[PDB]
Amino acid sequence: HVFRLKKWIQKVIDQFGE
Structure with missing residues (x-):
């Protein structure tokens, strides 16, 4: 979606933006 x-x-991303 981004x-x-x-x-x-x-x-x-799970760790890049919680």
């Missing part, structure tokens, strides 16, 4: 997808690396 740019293209947040599932391809939900793990990385």
